Amino acid sequence: GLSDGEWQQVLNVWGKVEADIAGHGQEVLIRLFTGHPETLEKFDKFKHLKTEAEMKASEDLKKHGTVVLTALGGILKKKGHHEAELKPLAQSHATKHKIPIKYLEFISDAIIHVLHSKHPGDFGADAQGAMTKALELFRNDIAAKYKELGFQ
Numbered sequence: 001g002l003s004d005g006e007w008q009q010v011l012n013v014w015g016k017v018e019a020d021i022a023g024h025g026q027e028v029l030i031r032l033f034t035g036h037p038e039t040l041e042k043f044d045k046f047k048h049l050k051t052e053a054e055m056k057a058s059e060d061l062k063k064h065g066t067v068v069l070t071a072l073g074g075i076l077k078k079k080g081h082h083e084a085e086l087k088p089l090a091q092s093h094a095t096k097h098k099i100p101i102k103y104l105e106f107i108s109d110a111i112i113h114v115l116h117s118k119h120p121g122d123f124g125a126d127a128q129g130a131m132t133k134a135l136e137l138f139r140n141d142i143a144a145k146y147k148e149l150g151f152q
């Protein structure tokens with residue numbers, strides 16, 4: 001649960017992402033795949049990528065980066081009122097993609113890393129706190145749906 005001041009910070013930071021959603025999305029996925037190679041194995045259409053250069057050169061990875069952050073942005077813009085938006089994502093990730101909640105923790109931290117990397121000195125302590133809380137909220141609500149489904 002975030003305050004309005006905190007949501008304000010979240011949406012302020014998100015303005016940075018929206019100026020270049022494909023670049024951000026690309027770097028998030030790259031940070032995830034290289035940081036946690038087991039995540040790569042969940043993607044049939046990226047499992048071919050062995051090296052980070054191939055990742056960096058992949059237009060389809062950038063495309064998926066756009067899809068992911070577009071979806072996340074839509075959810076963030078709801079400021080917590082995201083049940084309709086989130087449920088199908090929780091369902092597809094638990095039942096079709098079989099993504100453990102741990103991997104959602106991974107990508108959450110990856111977003112934090114990428115924002116610092118692309119905006120050094122421009123991602124303040126207050127901003128990080130707000131973004132972190134927003135991603136925790138997202139993760140926690142997904143986690144509730146995972147429990148419902150009995151998914152590990």
Ligand code: HEM
Binds near residue numbers: 042067097
């Ligand atoms: C902020 C976190 C995430 C968001 C917003 C997100 C969003 C999406 C969306 C919108 C799709 C396409 C529609 C669908 O299948 O539901 C998708 C597909 C997919 N996601 Fe996620 N996702 C997230 C995290 C993850 C993580 C952490 C993994 C694995 C480590 C993952 C694995 C997949 C896979 C394997 C697909 C299908 C890819 C394909 O074959 O086209 N997702 N995701």
